[PDB]
């Protein structure tokens, strides 16, 4: 093994003409071993080389073979595919399509030396020129859990199909010649193989932690490791970043630790490679996420707000010359969180309009705003569906900033609408424009807030006029809750006071925290209601914890291990250095160490914890 | 740039062109030379 490439993942998309294609496939995967993400071999035409590809040992996501027209693929010691990534829902192995108008294109396909697809299934449909795959035992390629999650076709009905090898399994093989004929590491076998073997019989057992076949007997003489190689050894994981601390009863900074990259174990991250809380050295992080340094290893973070998308806005930018969001608008600004610009929401949105070709927007769409936490501009909103009974849309708004503001007065407008509500329950900051609330004959809540909390500018003034009377609501009994502070409402619920009167939960006003007999277990601190851990067992009529965190619960649900609760007491853990931490439990569920000289693990005290 | 009904239903970028395969029944993008990735989101780390 060595040498590494990153693996692509075009699925079906097409790098330019087929020539560019095949350039890019060569330059992906000339000289290549090991694939770390997936091998994808589509487009390709008759008559090109394609004898790269003899050269790749593993695949660590899937294989994707599709729409080629050439007779021949030759992944002529392809080992693994360990379907770390599937395609399409499911397949580790997808063999879609390799024809054109004519019905040829794939006839060879000549897998030798496959004979490990560790997760995922297998997939084939019309290749009507492929040989002898037809013929395989894949029970013996793919693990039991993937077998019922086939879908196998091979329909010609004749062609340039040469029989197998007589010196072949059950006649199967992968072409012509004695070379191709499957070799069977699993079927064959024996009652005490647990794992892999390189024969009939029970001495020929594979260590478990072999994944193809092995050479011998050790584990040091697999063909490739199930999980990680670490050196020249294969091993269930990498040395760990975390070690367990005696002293602390928790874990510590492991000096002796190793990421993980690929299947491989490494002393530190190559190239220029960030890392994940699986502890594993990647190329770029997810879509939920992205970080930058903390403390000299590049890790990578979750964003834990849908990650920040700077949008453009009504006026300005590509949508210039739109009067609000539309129906030909409102996509546009799907996983946005502020908006580099104004907000306009006018009549001709629901309505639509004959001069710009726009037909009414679905009331429903709004929606798409939901994600908006700042607006740089003004936010303007003329119209809104009279179903709608709340300024919903805009639940996660946190700022306005008003750096332009309507009529150059204006960062807020809520004019001449149907709602109930002002729906702004996330609104802590309108800076430095003025607000307008107008018109809304059943707006009932905009009085009871302090807007002059929310300005950043000292002279900004409020208009809430020509709503309803205070008389009205008050009659119509719309008032704050009564779990709300003098603070204010964004409505009616408890989910929308500005502050609360006694105690939050999360993001509701509440009164009792669940000290004495809630859902789960409830500390106060700082007037808020915060779960207790889940070790913590409840105690009726009295308190069930005193803070945050497993050393905080009067008494634990499970075990003892220092001064925490745990579920299960540490069983084979790594150490300050060498060995495993293993512990029983005593009577009292406490946790206390094992006999040094067991390792296996113990069952109780001393050396009759551990028998033989 | 052109909306393009993928799996996670992403537009191609990069001067890309979103087409249709027929025989799957599935989308996929057709990018400039120079540009990799499924929604052509990415330079090719080699060719600039
Ligand atoms: C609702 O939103 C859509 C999307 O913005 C708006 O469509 C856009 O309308 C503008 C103005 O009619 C078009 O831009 C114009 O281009 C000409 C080039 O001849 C330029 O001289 C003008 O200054 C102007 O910028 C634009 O093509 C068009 N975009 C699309 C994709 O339709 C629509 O106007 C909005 N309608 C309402 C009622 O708000
Ligand atoms: C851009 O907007 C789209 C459309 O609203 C968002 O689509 C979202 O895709 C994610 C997939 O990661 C969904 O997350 C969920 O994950 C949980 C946990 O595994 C799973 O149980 C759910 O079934 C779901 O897949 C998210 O709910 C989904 N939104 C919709 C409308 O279904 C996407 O969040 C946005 N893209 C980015 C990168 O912000
Ligand atoms: C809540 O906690 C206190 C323990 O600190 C309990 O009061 C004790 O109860 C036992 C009765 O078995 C007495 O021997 C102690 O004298 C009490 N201690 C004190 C300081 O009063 C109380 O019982 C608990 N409540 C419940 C429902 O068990
Ligand atoms: C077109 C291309 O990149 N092919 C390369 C070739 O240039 C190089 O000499 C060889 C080294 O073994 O690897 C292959
Ligand atoms: C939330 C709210 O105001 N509900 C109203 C209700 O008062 C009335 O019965 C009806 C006709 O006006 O429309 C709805
Ligand atoms: C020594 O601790 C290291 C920490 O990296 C751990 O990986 C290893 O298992 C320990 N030694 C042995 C052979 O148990
Ligand atoms: C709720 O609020 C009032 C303060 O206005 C307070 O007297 C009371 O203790 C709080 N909690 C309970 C148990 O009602
Ligand atoms: C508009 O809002 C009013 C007042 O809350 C409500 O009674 C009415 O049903 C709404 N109109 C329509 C057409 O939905």
Redesign the pocket.
């Known amino acids: 093994e060595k040498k590494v490439c990153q693996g692509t993942s075009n699925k079906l998309t097409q790098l330019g003409t087929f020539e560019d294609h095949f350039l890019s496939l060569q330059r992906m995967f000339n000289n290549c071993e090991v694939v770390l993400g997936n091998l994808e071999i589509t487009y390709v035409q008759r008559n090109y080389d394609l004898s790269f590809l003899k050269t790749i040992q593993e695949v660590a996501g899937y294989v994707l073979i599709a729409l080629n027209t050439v007779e021949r693929i030759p992944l002529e010691n392809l080992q693994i595919i360990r379907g770390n990534m599937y395609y399409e829902n499911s397949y580790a192995l997808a063999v879609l399509s390799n024809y054109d108008a004519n019905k040829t294109g794939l006839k060879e396909l000549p897998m030798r030396n496959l004979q490990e697809i560790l997760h995922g299934a297998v997939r084939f449909s019309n290749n009507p020129a492929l040989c002898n795959v037809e013929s395989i035992q894949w029970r013996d390629i793919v693990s039991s859990d993937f077998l019922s999650n086939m879908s196998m076709d091979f329909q010609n009905h004749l062609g340039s199909c040469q029989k197998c090898d007589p010196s072949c399994p059950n006649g199967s093989c992968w072409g012509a010649g004695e070379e191709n004929c499957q070799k069977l590491t699993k079927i064959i076998c024996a009652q005490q193989c647990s794992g892999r073997c390189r024969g009939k019989s029970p001495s020929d057992c594979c260590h478990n932690q072999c994944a193809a076949g092995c050479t011998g007997p050790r584990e040091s003489d697999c063909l490739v490791c199930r999980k990680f190689r670490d050196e020249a050894t294969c091993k269930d994981t990498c040395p760990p970043l975390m070690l367990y601390n005696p002293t602390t009863y928790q874990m510590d900074v492991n000096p002796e630790g190793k990421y993980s990259f690929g299947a491989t174990c490494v002393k530190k991250c190559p190239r220029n490679y960030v890392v994940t809380d699986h502890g594993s050295c990647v190329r770029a992080c997810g879509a939920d996420s992205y970080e930058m340094e903390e403390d000299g290893v590049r890790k990578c973070k979750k964003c834990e707000g849908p990650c920040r998308k700077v949008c453009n806005g009504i006026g300005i930018g ?12 409102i996509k546009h600004f799907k996983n946005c969180t502020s908006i580099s610009g104004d907000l306009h929401i ?1 009549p ?2 629901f309505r ?2 004959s ?4 037909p009414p927007l679905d009331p429903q769409e709004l929606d798409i705003l939901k994600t908006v936490k700042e607006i740089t501009g003004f936010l303007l909103i003329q119209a809104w569906p009279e179903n709608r009974t709340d300024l919903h849309a805009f639940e996660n708004l946190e700022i306005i900033r008003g750096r332009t503001k309507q009529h150059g007065q204006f960062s807020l407008a809520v004019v001449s609408l149907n709602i109930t509500s002002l729906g702004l329950r996330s609104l802590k900051e309108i800076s430095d424009g003025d607000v307008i609330i107008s018109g809304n004959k059943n707006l009932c809540y905009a009085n009871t807030i302090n807007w002059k909390k929310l300005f950043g500018t000292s002279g900004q003034k409020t208009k809430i006029i020509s709503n309803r009377g205070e008389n009205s609501c008050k009659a119509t009994g719309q008032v704050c809750h009564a779990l709300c502070s003098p603070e204010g409402c964004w409505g009616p619920e408890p989910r929308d006071c500005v502050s609360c009167r006694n105690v939050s939960r999360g993001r509701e006003c509440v009164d009792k925290c669940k000290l004495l007999e809630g859902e789960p277990r409830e500390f106060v601190e700082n007037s808020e209601c915060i779960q207790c851990h889940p070790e913590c067992l409840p105690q009726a009529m009295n308190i069930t914890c005193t803070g945050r965190g497993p050393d905080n619960c009067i008494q634990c649900a499970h075990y003892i291990d220092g001064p925490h609760c745990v579920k299960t007491c540490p069983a084979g853990v790594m150490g300050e250095n060498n060995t495993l931490v293993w512990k029983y439990a005593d009577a009292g569920h406490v946790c206390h160490l094992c006999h040094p000289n067991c390792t296996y693990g113990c069952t109780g005290p001393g050396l009759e914890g551990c028998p033989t | 740039d052109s909306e393009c009904p993928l799996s996670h239903d992403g537009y191609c970028l990069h001067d890309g062109v979103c087409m249709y395969i027929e025989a799957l029944d599935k989308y996929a993008c057709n990018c400039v030379v120079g540009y990799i990735g499924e929604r052509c989101q990415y330079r090719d780390l080699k060719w600039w």
Do not use: M, P, R, Y
Not at chain 1, 324 to 329: D, G, P, R, V, Y
Not at chain 1, 355 to 358: A, Q, Y
């Open positions: 590509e949508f210039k010359d739109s009067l609000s969001i539309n129906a030909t608008n006018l001709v949105a639509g309009d001069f710009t070709h726009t």
